[PDB]
Amino acid sequence: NSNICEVCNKWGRLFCCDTCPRSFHEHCHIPSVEANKNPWSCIFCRIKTIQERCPESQSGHQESEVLMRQMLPEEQLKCEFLLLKVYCDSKSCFFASEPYYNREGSQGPQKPMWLNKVKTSLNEQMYTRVEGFVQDMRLIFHNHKEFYREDKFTRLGIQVQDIFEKNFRNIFAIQETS
Ligand SMILES: [Zn+2]
Ligand SMILES: [Zn+2]
Ligand SMILES: [Zn+2]
Numbered sequence: 522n523s524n525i526c527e528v529c530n531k532w533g534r535l536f537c538c539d540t541c542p543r544s545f546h547e548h549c550h551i552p553s554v555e556a557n558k559n560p561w562s563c564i565f566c567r568i569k570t571i572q573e574r575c576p577e578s579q580s581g582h583q584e585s586e587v588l589m590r591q592m593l594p595e596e597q598l599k600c601e602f603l604l605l606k607v608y609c610d611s612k613s614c615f616f617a618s619e620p621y622y623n624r625e626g627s628q629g630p631q632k633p634m635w636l637n638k639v640k641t642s643l644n645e646q647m648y649t650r651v652e653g654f655v656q657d658m659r660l661i662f663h664n665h666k667e668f669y670r671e672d673k674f675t676r677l678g679i680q681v682q683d684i685f686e687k688n689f690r691n692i693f694a695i696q697e698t699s
Contacts, residue, residue: 522535522537522538522543524544526545526549527544527545527549528546528550528605529549530611531546537561538561538562538563539560540566549608550563550605551564551602551608551640552564564601564605571598579694581696582694582696584695587693587695588650588655589650589651590651592646592649592653596651597643597646600654602692603654603688604639604654606688606692607636607658607685608636610681612681613636615665615677616662617635618637619637622668624668627670629668630667630668632664633664634657634664636661638657639658659685661678662679662685665677
């Protein structure tokens, strides 16, 4: 197994996947690494199994259809994995914890949002459809763009949103377009 966490790339108290060489800190994995379970399979392995059991699940889909799916176990897992893929980027640190807004010439957003809030919402089963999760994720970046206006720091939102969107298209097998 790897000697660093797959998400944050640090050593520490790591839990090792039994079906692949990845390792994780307890709370870097999503969901948090389960108490018992030997063997243990990580989220990457669990997603791969879904695909293998239903190869047709990789045929292209319309975003509008994906968003209306109810959050049954497989869609729950896919959203957890997509959230994890965002945390895998180091620029996610800017969006992880609760923001505050006091900048000359800007007003804070009406509905603040952050990664750890989405993480909690998923843990507590607060989303009934994929749309709920995707709307909160996109709102993180939209709030950032709006608040930072022409400061070059706005680009961090564009960057992390692009990681989100690329992974959303991959995980939910959105039909490729130009
Ligand atoms: Zn970690
Ligand atoms: Zn694994
Ligand atoms: Zn099948």
